[PDB]
Structure formats: structure tokens, C-alpha cells
Amino acid sequence: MNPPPPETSNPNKPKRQTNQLQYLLRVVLKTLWKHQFAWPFQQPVDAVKLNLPDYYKIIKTPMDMGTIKKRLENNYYWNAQECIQDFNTMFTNCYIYNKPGDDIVLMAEALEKLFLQKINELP
Numbered sequence: 001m002n003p004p005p006p007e008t009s010n011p012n013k014p015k016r017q018t019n020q021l022q023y024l025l026r027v028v029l030k031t032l033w034k035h036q037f038a039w040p041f042q043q044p045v046d047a048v049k050l051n052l053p054d055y056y057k058i059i060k061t062p063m064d065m066g067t068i069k070k071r072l073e074n075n076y077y078w079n080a081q082e083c084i085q086d087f088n089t090m091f092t093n094c095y096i097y098n099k100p101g102d103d104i105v106l107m108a109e110a111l112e113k114l115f116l117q118k119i120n121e122l123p
């Protein structure tokens, strides 16, 4: 099975709008989202569709760019570091679940390289 997806709203969670979070949406997420390797990461892993009942037995903190995008658009975060942590969870999950040299890992590695280039000069 699939678990419920990560929340993208939480009314009693306190929220901030910062220039760093705006840049994460307008630049970092936008750049990754258009990439030719973005597609597996644009929504939660669908273990039912992929017939991978093991996925959510291995990965207990799922995260994906569709969730991050909605969190940024919906003003979910307190600060930029919280969002950066979500990106790192997404990449790390993929490295944990898969093996070096797998196609999905090559895709994550290319996206991570671009991610780090964009954050290397946040505002």
C-alpha cells in the first residue's frame, strides 16, 4: 500500500514568508520541476502503481517535489532550512531505497547537483 501523502497544510503550524523561501519557489523548485529527470519526483511514490509493497517499509519519511511545491505555494514553512530539509529527505530516500548507478539514482544525483548550484547563492 500507499500511506497518506505528506501534509501540505497545517493550520496551527506557524508560517513565515521570507525572501529565501520565495527564492526556493521561484528559482530552485521551478528549475528542478522543468528538468527532464523531474518526473519521478513530481508526486509521492505510488507503490500500488509500481507494485512495490516494500517501498514504504523502507522509507518512513517520504518526500517529493510535488509536496514541496504545494508547501511553498501554500506558505507551509517557517524558514528556508525547513524546505531544504525536505529536498534532502527526498534525495536521501532515493539513495537509501535504490543502489548506486540505478537510473533513478542518476536522476536524483543530477537534480541534487542542480539544487546545490541554485542554493549556493540564496538571497
Ligand SMILES: Cc1n[nH]c(C)c1-c1ccnc(Nc2ccc3c(c2)N(C(C)C)[C@H](C)C(=O)N3C)n1
Pocket: 039, 040, 041, 045, 046, 050, 052, 055, 093, 094, 097, 098, 103, 104
Ligand atoms: C523509473 C522506473 N524504473 N522501472 C520502472 C517500472 C520505473 C517507473 C515507471 C513508472 N513510474 C515510475 N515512477 C517512480 C517514481 C519515483 C521513484 C521510482 C519510480 N523508483 C523506481 C526505481 C521504482 C523508486 C521507487 C524511487 O526511489 N523513486 C523516487 N517509475
